[PDB]
């Protein structure tokens, strides 16, 4: 929906340790430098592209099962 | 989807579920078989149960279709091997792995969900006459899964 | 010397006054003042970048009326 574009996104930078999320659970791939990360209301973030598809059909944080609209 | 199926396959190797095996039967990665040993200190102790695992085309956005091939006496598992489990249908999430599903099934065998049953008669025995429930389960474990 | 927006939380709104020269770590404290959030609970994001506590509004190039994104981390999500 349009809602998926209203959530923050930010290219990952390995050097700075602001979040403890080192892995996109949908891809099961470490976060790689400059990759686009999408953060959900619940402070859970994944690969933007990777989690984007899941929000089309569902609306819950894959990790903690929290709504994100 | 392929890439993530392979990922899970390594994850199983690095942290194999307790007395459980799973993997593709042949060259097709989307169809696996799995075996689970009946949990110790359960009615099923000593049994070997075989399962089929089928990954949807768009896995992990759709959950895998899992089913028993071995007959089993259990309130949430029917004579067709269908399994009444929540993570497999409506509580499915990309964050879930094949390992987590196998461990959930493994715990379901230890602790059924008789309040939301797949086989009423056996649910009703489980709540009211657990002693009969286990003897029958032990009998079935002894008969079709040894 | 400049208006800024941080409308987020889904209960979005917030208008702030600041100087370009203000470090992000000043920003998070002014958000603690308009709102109750402890600064270390705050994750500021803008034009595709996390904002480093030490860097400033000029560094990142935030111009008047830029509307920015706050994410609340929790004590054990
Ligand atoms: Zn990913
Ligand atoms: Zn979450």
Numbering used by the authors:
A (entry chain C): 390 to 458
B (entry chain A): 2 to 147
C (entry chain F): 0 to 76
Paper lines:
RING family ubiquitin ligases (E3s) employ the RING domain to recruit the E2 thioester ubiquitin (E2∼Ub) intermediate to catalyze the transfer of ubiquitin (Ub) to substrates. We chose the RING domain of RNF38 to use as a model monomeric RING with a native LPArg.
Having determined the crystal structure of RNF38RING alone to elucidate the position of Arg454, we subsequently attempted to crystallize a subset of RNF38RING LP variants, namely, R454Y, R454K, R454D, R454N, R454W, and R454M in complex with UBE2D2S22R,C85K−Ub. In the RNF38RING-R454Y/UBE2D2S22R,C85K−Ub complex, RNF38RING-R454Y/UBE2D2 interaction is preserved as observed in the prior structure of the RNF38RING/UBE2D2S22R,C85K−Ub complex. In contrast, UbD is not in the closed conformation but rather oriented away from RNF38RING-R454Y. Therefore, this could represent an extremely weak site for Ub with Kd in the hundreds of micromolar range or higher and the contacts observed in the crystals are likely due to crystal packing akin to those reported for RNF38RING/UBE2K−Ub/K48-Ub2. (A) There are two copies of the RNF38R454Y/UBE2D2S22R,C85K−Ub complex in the asymmetric unit, with no discernible structural differences between either RNF38R454Y (magenta) or the E2s. The electron density for one of the Ub molecules (salmon) is markedly better for one of the two copies—the poorer copy is missing loops with only the core interpretable, so we focused our analysis on the better copy. Although the C-terminal helix of UBE2D2 shifts by 2 Å, the contacts between UBE2D2 and RNF38 are similarly maintained in the structure of the mutant complex, whereas the conformation of UbD varies greatly.
